């Protein structure tokens, strides 16, 4: 499957030269780095091409990398039940950059893009129903960004005065403890 995945990666790199930035095969998985402007065209090719028939969209997610000029990665996981193979597609996205929506290709991409928008704040263009899907109504912020606190900023309580569940600033009886165990020794890479 390692030779098979390398052969498949050449087929994609050849047929979609301008979409593909590079390919990698690590830990038995093929990853394709693609340009933002060509990701929809490439995923469409992967879905429909005979050699690579990736007709199941497994999921879409994002990864935050604040140290990088384009801080976000958007990652597409696709499965082919007919060819019995998997592929990962990665695109680098800058903050406030728009990502084209995949709902034209996969109707089931709709909720995954809402989740990326909710938890990372990445907007998708061409999305019919783009609204928060997992956080509370009117939530401020995007919790899966590395610079959002784990406990957030606000918490709810039932107020006897307002007879409502209201938000208040977070007050922790015991503050979150973040132990740092990491050793100053990397170890060796023996040949």
């Amino acid at each position: 499957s390692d030779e098979a995945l390398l052969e498949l990666a050449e087929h994609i790199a050849l047929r979609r030269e301008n979409d593909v930035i590079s390919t990698q095969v690590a830990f038995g998985e093929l990853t394709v780095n693609a340009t933002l402007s060509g990701v929809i065209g490439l995923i469409e090719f992967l879905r429909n091409d005979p050699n690579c028939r990736f007709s199941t969209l497994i999921d879409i997610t994002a990864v935050d990398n604040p140290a990088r000029p384009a801080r976000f990665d958007v990652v597409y996981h696709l499965l082919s039940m007919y060819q019995n193979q998997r592929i990962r597609v990665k695109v680098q996205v800058r903050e406030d950059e728009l990502v084209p929506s995949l709902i034209g290709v996969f109707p089931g991409a709709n909720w995954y893009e809402r989740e990326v928008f909710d938890l990372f704040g990445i907007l998708f263009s061409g999305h019919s129903d783009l609204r928060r899907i997992l956080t509370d109504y009117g939530f401020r912020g995007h919790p899966l960004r590395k610079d959002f606190p784990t406990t957030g900023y606000v918490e709810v309580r039932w107020s006897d005065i307002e007879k409502r569940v209201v938000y208040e600033p977070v007050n922790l009886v015991q503050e979150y403890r973040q132990f740092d165990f990491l050793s100053p020794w990397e170890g060796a890479k023996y040949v």
């Binding site: 956080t135 509370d136 109504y137 959002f148 784990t150 918490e155 709810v156 309580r157 039932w158 409502r164």
Partner: protein, 148 residues
Amino acid sequence: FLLTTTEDIINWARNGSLHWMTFGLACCAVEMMQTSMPRYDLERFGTAPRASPRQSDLMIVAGTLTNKMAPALRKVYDQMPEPRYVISMGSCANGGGYYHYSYSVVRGCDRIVPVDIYVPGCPPTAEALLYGILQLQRRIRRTGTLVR
């Protein structure tokens, strides 16, 4: 005497006919369900489920209460006729549990509704919940009046 024995009869009827709202939030609801299944048969105590809050005397908060869910739990509690009792089941409902430090979780359901009994565990076993329900019955016998 008349009034204490009257309360005893009221507490006897309320303990023997304790109907709970069909309301399960998470994996504490799995063990709550096992409590009503043949091995334990919660209903043999007269403690039967009711779909509507208008017919419920007992709310078992069985699972994590998120911020988004908190208004809905308060609403159905508010629509329980009185007397109404609340059991907090499991770590999440008791104090937030494994998600205590999350941005989207209520750190204990007693921030939303008053609680009568706390059942510890993650989840409490079906038997532990049954014990907690009987501790609520002791509490009502000890302190129950016509008001509650």
